[PDB]
Design a protein around this nucleic acid. Structure first.
Ligand SMILES: [Mg+2]
Ligand SMILES: [Mg+2]
Length: 114
RNA sequence: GGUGACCUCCCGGGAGCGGGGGACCACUA
C-alpha cells in the first residue's frame, strides 16, 4: 500500500483535546498546562498550522476516543504532514508532533478572531 | 514497597495507543 510519510494516511494527528488547558493528561492533554489554551477548536488548529506553511487537512467530523460527548463542538482532527517521501522534514521548525502542538497552542490565542 | 489521583519530562507511533524517568498527594506492613 501507499505508506510513505507524504501519503495522507501517514500524516500525524492532532485532536483539540491535546492542547486544551482544561483537560487532564488522562483526558488527552499532551502539552503542559502553562502552554495549553482554552477551548481550542480543530478549525483554529488547521488555520494556524496551514498559515505557517505545513501541509494539513481537517477531518471535521472525526471524534476523539476519550471524549464521550459527540456534539459538534467536540469534533475535528487535523492531519499534518511532517516528512517528505524520503523521510526528511518538511520544515526544520517542525521535527515532531510535539513541536506542532506547542506552535499551534502558541498561535491560537493570537488569532484576530479571539 | 504496592496501588490509585494529579503534575512534569524523555523515547516510539497513522489513530485508538506503546515504553520509560521524576514530582506531588492519597490509601496502605
Ligand atoms: Mg509519567
Ligand atoms: Mg506515554
Amino acid at each position: 500500500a501507499a505508506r510513505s510519510p507524504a501519503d495522507q494516511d501517514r500524516f500525524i494527528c492532532i485532536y483539540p483535546a491535546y492542547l486544551n488547558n482544561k483537560k487532564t493528561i488522562a483526558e488527552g492533554r499532551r502539552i503542559p498546562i502553562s502552554k495549553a489554551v482554552e477551548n481550542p477548536t480543530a478549525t483554529e488548529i488547521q488555520d494556524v498550522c496551514s498559515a505557517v506553511g505545513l501541509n494539513v487537512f481537517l477531518e471535521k467530523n472525526k471524534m476523539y476516543s476519550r471524549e464521550w460527548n459527540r456534539d459538534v463542538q467536540y469534533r475535528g482532527r487535523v492531519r499534518v504532514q511532517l516528512k517528505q517521501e524520503d523521510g526528511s522534514l518538511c520544515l526544520v521548525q517542525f521535527p515532531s508532533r510535539k513541536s506542532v502542538m506547542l506552535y499551534a497552542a502558541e498561535m491560537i490565542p493570537k488569532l484576530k478572531t479571539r
